[PDB]
Write a protein that binds this ligand. Structure first.
Ligand code: HEM
Ligand SMILES: CC1(C)[C@@H]2CC[C@@]1(C)C(=O)C2
Ligand SMILES: [K+]
Ligand SMILES: [K+]
Ligand SMILES: [K+]
Ligand SMILES: [K+]
Length: 405
């Protein structure tokens, strides 16, 4: 059942776009937003779907709503208000510039050095998985690589055993996409019931893990509370078991169908850092938003307090006004223009671990396993959300193409 239209919204901006069922879904769950960038479609639109909300269709308009953060807040980013109200993650839901000490702590809970602490562990684990798969001609990559590679790095970084993985990979996904079982409030309170005997354990005995940096950070003249250690852990926990796992999945949902894009990285290994950056332009899996904090003037219209706007990453990523060659793919980037880390005050503070993980994966797959596709019969079903997903990724290859490394 679509919403009524508010009294302050005029009909010429109406598009009844649905966030969780995007209108051109069969193109890929980032390209399936591209229809919003047709010529007749303004820079700003409103929909009646999902309780009714603005959508910013272009990279400039998106970034101009990350730059007026003093009017556009992340205290509610989830366009389903029942999940936006429940949300409270750190740094992101705290107001800058007085956020500053929470994010400085984040940037020493995870930073370029931590990638140097796990890099050989990254390496040998991509090597040992991709040696285990090398001659096997098939796998379901969402489960035979993408979930157990980075999660067995993030768990070991945080100091948690492997045996909680399907219980935390259950909860993360229940927060990030609407399955139906748990609300965000439910899945969050269940996460926190599980993690606060662990954060308390990190107060009783600190250790060489990241949660023992989260729990003992000093901020605004005081300790970081459990109230706030649990909320900063929720972010990281969405970070290392959903954004980097689904991104991995999408990256091969492209190289699967792409014989030349694979060859380009075989002839020239020095495109592998630039191909991740274009993969982060292209397969920018996120559908973020923000709430209006005052009544405010935008794009020729007045917006009201308690209004919510979607600012989709892939509508910077694909936009002809930002990015040269945006539907076609090539890896020769010197520069690129997109929001798959946010903007201005917000900046992804974890994804440099995933950069070296994907780039290890890229450089150590295209050797052992150079030529490959998705299983025949298999159709890939894509899941839209505040972070987007897929159902399952069954890859195939001939054992006789494959190289011992
Ligand atoms: C490649 C996969 C990932 C992508 C696509 C991604 C995307 C993003 C985006 C778009 C932001 C800003 C959101 C906002 O404006 O509120 C963000 C925030 C953040 N990310 Fe990532 N990220 C990824 C992986 C990770 C990893 C693996 C971690 C965990 C170590 C992580 C932790 C963070 C942190 C701590 C923030 C908060 C930054 C802030 O407050 O400015 N991210 N990331
Ligand atoms: C983890 C995210 C980057 C994703 C979009 C904004 C964010 C902070 C969320 O809460 C979901
Ligand atoms: K267009
Ligand atoms: K500003
Ligand atoms: K298997
Ligand atoms: K699994």
């Amino acid at each position: 059942n679509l919403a009524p239209l508010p009294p302050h919204v005029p009909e010429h901006l109406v598009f009844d776009f649905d966030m969780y069922n995007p209108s051109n879904l069969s193109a890929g769950v980032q390209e399936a937003w591209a229809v919003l960038q047709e010529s007749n479609v303004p820079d700003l639109v409103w929909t009646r779907c999902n309780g009714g909300h603005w959508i910013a269709t272009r990279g400039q308009l998106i970034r101009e709503a990350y730059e007026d953060y003093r009017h556009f807040s992340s205290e509610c980013p989830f366009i389903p208000r029942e999940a936006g109200e429940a949300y409270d993650f750190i740094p992101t839901s705290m107001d800058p510039p007085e956020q500053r000490q929470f994010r400085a702590l984040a940037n020493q809970v995870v930073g370029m050095p931590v990638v140097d602490k796990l890099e050989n562990r990254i390496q040998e684990l991509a090597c040992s998985l991709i040696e285990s798969l090398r001659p096997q001609g098939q796998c379901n990559f969402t489960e035979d690589y993408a979930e157990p590679f980075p999660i067995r790095i993030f768990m070991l970084l945080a100091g948690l055993p492997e045996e909680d993985i399907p219980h935390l990979k259950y909860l993360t996904d229940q927060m990030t996409r609407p399955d139906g079982s748990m609300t965000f409030a439910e899945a969050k309170e269940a996460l926190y019931d599980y993690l606060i005997p662990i954060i308390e354990q990190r107060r009783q005995k600190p250790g060489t893990d990241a949660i023992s940096i989260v729990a003992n950070g000093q901020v605004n003249g005081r300790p970081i509370t459990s109230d706030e250690a649990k909320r900063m852990c929720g972010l990281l926990l969405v970070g290392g078991l959903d954004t980097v796992v689904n991104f991995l999945s999408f990256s091969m949902e492209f190289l699967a169908k792409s014989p030349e894009h694979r060859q380009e990285l075989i002839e020239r290994p020095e495109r592998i850092p630039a191909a991740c950056e274009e993969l982060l332009r292209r397969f920018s899996l996120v559908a973020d938003g923000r709430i209006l904090t005052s009544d405010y003037e935008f794009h020729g219209v007045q917006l009201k307090k308690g209004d919510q706007i979607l600012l989709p990453q892939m509508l910077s990523g694909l936009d002809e006004r930002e990015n040269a060659c945006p539907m076609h793919v090539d890896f020769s980037r010197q520069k690129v223009s997109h929001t798959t880390f946010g903007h201005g005050s917000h900046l992804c503070l974890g994804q440099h671990l995933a950069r070296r993980e994907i780039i290890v994966t890229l450089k150590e797959w295209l050797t052992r396993i150079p030529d490959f596709s998705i299983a025949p019969g298999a159709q890939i079903q894509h899941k839209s959300g505040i972070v987007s997903g897929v159902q399952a990724l069954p890859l195939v290859w001939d054992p006789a193409t494959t190289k011992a490394v």
